[PDB]
């Protein structure tokens, strides 16, 4: 019963190790850190400034004259302005999944779960995680693109044709509120992990082992936020509510991809994105 009455939470030292372990994976796993993205956006960098796309002239100069590491699919370059821009986004999404999946392996005891459970977790998780990481690349003016090489204005994106004009505003709406929390990469590392390990995911065979890890990570994250953001109390709470907004972005995202599947034969969804969106909400 003295053993039974060890209902207490694990020691901070073990949690900090978990925090650090997760962080390293995160740094290794991903190309762009917030710390990095911020350097570019605030201009505190000797790194080449990024090319601002605010209209068609800018866009065309970018496509024509500026060197980009991330490009619109070569086949798709023939297309209407609104298609190309978005096709290029779609391509960078494909990579993000690979990166994200790699990161999840790093989570202590992710692979020790059932693969029917463990694959489901990613199916629902990835876009929530992508939108979370995208916000590091955004401000009210627009979004960083192609590993910081370009910057594309929010208002330009709203000047695109329907339904693409309204496509990105809900992410911008979210990114300005999320970025107001003033999180950093070490906080984000754990928070991403928390997103993946959810017992609410549909079609999960073994919720109990998952709920136990998430609890582990929520404990880890809560302490990390306590240590890292003393000024903001209930950041843990405020941050956990953003998971709601992430969901809502992702559901609306899919519902707009229905329009795209019905509206254009020439917008072709990648086999992987198609797999993930298949039988999703």
């Amino acid at each position: 019963i003295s053993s039974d009455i060890d209902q207490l939470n694990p020691e901070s030292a073990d949690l900090r190790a978990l925090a650090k372990h997760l962080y390293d994976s995160y740094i290794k796993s991903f190309p762009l850190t917030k710390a990095k993205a911020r350097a570019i956006l605030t201009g505190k960098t000797t790194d080449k400034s990024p090319f601002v796309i605010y209209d068609m002239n800018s866009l065309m100069m970018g496509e024509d004259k500026i060197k980009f590491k991330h490009i619109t699919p070569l086949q798709e370059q023939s297309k209407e302005v609104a298609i190309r821009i978005f096709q290029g986004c779609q391509f960078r999404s494909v990579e993000a999944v690979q990166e994200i999946t790699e990161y999840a392996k790093s989570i202590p005891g992710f692979v020790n779960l059932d693969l029917n459970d463990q694959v489901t977790l990613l199916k629902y998780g990835v876009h929530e995680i992508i939108y979370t990481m995208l916000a590091s690349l955004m401000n009210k003016d627009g979004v960083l693109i192609s590993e910081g090489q370009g910057f594309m204005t929010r208002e330009f994106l709203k000047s695109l044709r329907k339904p693409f004009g309204d496509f990105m505003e809900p992410k911008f709406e979210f990114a300005v509120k999320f970025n107001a929390l003033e999180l950093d990469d070490s906080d984000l590392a754990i928070f991403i992990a928390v997103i993946i390990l959810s017992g609410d995911r549909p079609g999960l065979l073994n919720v109990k082992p998952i709920e136990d890890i998430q609890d582990n990570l929520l404990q880890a994250l809560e302490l990390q936020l306590k240590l890292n953001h003393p000024e903001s109390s209930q950041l843990f709470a405020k941050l956990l509510q953003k998971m709601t907004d992430l969901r809502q972005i992702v559901t609306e995202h899919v519902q707009l991809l229905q329009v795209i599947k019905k509206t254009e034969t020439d917008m072709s969804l990648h086999p992987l994105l198609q797999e993930i969106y298949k039988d999703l909400y």
């Binding site: 999946t101 692979v111 693969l115 463990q118 694959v119 199916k123 797999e275 993930i276």
Partner: peptide, 9 residues
Amino acid sequence: HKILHRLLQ
């Protein structure tokens, strides 16, 4: 769900 469980290997 074939591409995903490939990447989980």
